[PDB]
Amino acid sequence: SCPAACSCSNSRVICTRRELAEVPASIPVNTRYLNLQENSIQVIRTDTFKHLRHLEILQLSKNLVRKIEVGAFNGLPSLNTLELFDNRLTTVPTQAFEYLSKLRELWLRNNPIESIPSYAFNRVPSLRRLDLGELKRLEYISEAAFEGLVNLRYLNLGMCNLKDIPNLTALVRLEELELSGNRLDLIRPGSFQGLTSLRKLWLMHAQVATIERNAFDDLKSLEELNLSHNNLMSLPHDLFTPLHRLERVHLNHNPWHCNCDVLWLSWWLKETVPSCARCHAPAGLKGRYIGELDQSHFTCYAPVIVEPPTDLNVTEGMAAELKCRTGTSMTSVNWLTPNGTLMTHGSYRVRISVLHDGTLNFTNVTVQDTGQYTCMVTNSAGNTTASATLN
Numbered sequence: 492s493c494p495a496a497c498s499c500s501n502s503r504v505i506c507t508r509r510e511l512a513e514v515p516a517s518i519p520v521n522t523r524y525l526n527l528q529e530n531s532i533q534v535i536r537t538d539t540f541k542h543l544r545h546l547e548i549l550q551l552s553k554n555l556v557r558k559i560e561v562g563a564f565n566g567l568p569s570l571n572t573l574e575l576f577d578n579r580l581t582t583v584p585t586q587a588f589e590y591l592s593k594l595r596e597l598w599l600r601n602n603p604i605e606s607i608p609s610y611a612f613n614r615v616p617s618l619r620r621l622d623l624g625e626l627k628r629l630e631y632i633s634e635a636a637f638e639g640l641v642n643l644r645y646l647n648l649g650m651c652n653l654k655d656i657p658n659l660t661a662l663v664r665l666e667e668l669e670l671s672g673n674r675l676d677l678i679r680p681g682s683f684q685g686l687t688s689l690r691k692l693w694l695m696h697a698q699v700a701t702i703e704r705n706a707f708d709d710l711k712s713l714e715e716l717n718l719s720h721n722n723l724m725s726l727p728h729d730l731f732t733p734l735h736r737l738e739r740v741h742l743n744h745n746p747w748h749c750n751c752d753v754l755w756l757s758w759w760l761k762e763t764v765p766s767c768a769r770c771h772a773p774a775g776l777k778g779r780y781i782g783e784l785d786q787s788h789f790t791c792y793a794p795v796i797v798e799p800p801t802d803l804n805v806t807e808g809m810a811a812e813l814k815c816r817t818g819t820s821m822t823s824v825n826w827l828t829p830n831g832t833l834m835t836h837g838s839y840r841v842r843i844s845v846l847h848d849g850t851l852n853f854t855n856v857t858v859q860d861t862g863q864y865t866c867m868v869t870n871s872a873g874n875t876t877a878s879a880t881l882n
């Protein structure tokens with residue numbers, strides 16, 4: 492029995508383009524597809540979807556939806572996709588989607604949502620796509636927001652004005668990440684730590700001014716990387732070098748400073764060739780393609796350790812530090828322990844870690860860490876090292 496202002500087929504009901512204030516009651520039991528878009532629905536009550544055990548696609552987008560009650564989606568063991576975009580939701584309805592291991596797609600794009608609470612989507616761990624796009628009024632994301640989503644492949648946090656990248660370490664199977672249209676000032680290694688399966692990353696129009704040393708080294712399956720339209724002047728030495736599957740990169744519309752620090756990039760471009768980034772400065776090279784720069788225009792020498800490490804006598808328990816500040820800040824820094832273990836700002840080791848400065852940090856150090864440590868700095872022109880022991 493088909494409802495009034497709708498169009499039924501076969502298991503497909505179409506009730507679009509009608510001034511409907513609430514969901515119609517007379518819904519057939521055997522329906523998979525259900526379109527309730529371009530209507531004026533404000534509230535979604537508990538158990539509004541009765542006996543819909545065949546429902547795979549439910550579409551509640553482009554409405555004035557303001558409230559989704561507790562257990563609104565009970566009795567839906569077939570639900571695959573759910574659309575709620577272009578609505579007026581001020582939060583995410585955590586309790587609504589109660590026990591749904593069948594839900595694969597979720598679209599909360601373009602709502603006035605203010606935050607993503609701890610364990611927001613824990614009730615739907617089988618998610619594959621999650622669209623949180625155009626959340627212009629978003630003000631805070633929980634560190635434990637994206638817990639439970641171990642099967643998520645796609646995530647959209649575009650057009651949200653994010654100051655910092657939220658915690659994504661929980662998402663071990665992520666393959667595509669949209670972060671465009673944000674205010675992500677600088678990019679850190681730890682931002683992407685634990686995203687080895689990530690293939691595409693989009694940081695277009697992100698107001699990105701700096702990328703830290705070894706910021707991407709963890710993303711060892713990255714193929715597409717869009718840093719177009721940002722405030723990048725330079726990139727650290729050999730940022731992309733270790734990423735071996737990288738084949739589409741957009742570097743255009745950044746104020747590229749073409750000094751000695753760009754030569755690794757011009758060489759990488761000249762080599763890798765994604766198949767158009769131009770020098771914005773200095774005036775001598777303005778509008779020259781970065782990947783066509785030969786080395787003759789530049790005078791470059793080994794990197795200079797402005798602040799080399801001095802020897803330290805330390806107590807067992809207290810903090811410790813061995814400095815390695817350099818000219819420039821883009822020059823790559825590798826440390827070397829007395830073990831023979833090499834280290835980098837990209838590394839994910841507890842306690843001991845190389846801060847963005849280039850300095851090697853400690854916390855709760857032991858006496859058995861005694862030995863000679865060496866800072867190994869490299870740029871486009873050569874290698875330079877300085878070494879000092881700690882006790």
Ligand SMILES: *[C@@H]1O[C@H](CO)[C@@H](O)[C@H](O)[C@H]1NC(C)=O
Pocket residue numbers: 803804882
């Ligand atoms: C640290 O101790 C070693 C000997 O154990 C000594 O060579 C060194 O001068 C000491 N450093 C300072 C300045 O206390």
Ligand SMILES: [Zn+2]
Pocket residue numbers: 742743744745767768769770
């Ligand atoms: Zn350009």
